[PDB]
Amino acid sequence: MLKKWEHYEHTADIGIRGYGDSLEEAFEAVAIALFDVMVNVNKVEKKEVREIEVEAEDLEALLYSFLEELLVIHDIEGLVFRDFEVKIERVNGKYRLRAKAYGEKLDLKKHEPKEEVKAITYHDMKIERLPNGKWMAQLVPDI
Template identity: 75%
Template structure:
């Protein structure tokens, strides 16, 4: 089950995603990222984009994943509200995602904060004692 939240951080907002699998945690933290920018509950799945990124470790993978989503947002003006992630490891980590959303509509999506960049600040990707996965970081707002 995917869950996400924002958490207080000095002068910024942190984003955190939980899931019963690593993939679900990555999906949830991506939802948290876009919910910083818009009300993700109002984003419809009108178009989907497939992306593939790699990372030497899970934090590098998370950084690359969210950075690619942010680039799509900045370049094409898209916001996303649904993600289907698949992660494989064969020496390095590889993530494939289908990200679905639509062009940003200021009247519909209620824009909030502008996320300028993904950072490694307070970044963690870990398995929790209850068996769930958690992914978190503080983006540059």
């Protein structure tokens, strides 16, 4: 037989997606999804808070920036987060996001650690108002 080769389909990273009644709630929800890649997010208690503020020229960059700062907090302080309060406004020609992130220190016995997220990316990123008036935010982070 002559040697032969092929490509085949396999999972590549993982998709995260949030839905909400508002853009802000979709951002909150997809951030929960992000932490559920790393731990069982349902096991994360709200003991500590960190605040985020970022500006961007468009909503995609805003979402990237928000999630990447959450990842950085996670990487530096070892915090994991359960929920978020997000506010998005227009200020002097930019989008401004402010958020409160609620969570606690990683607990290896309790949080059911899964896999770390290496980086937020723009891969498959989409933010949209669906025909039914709900909002969706998604992306495929690098794991």
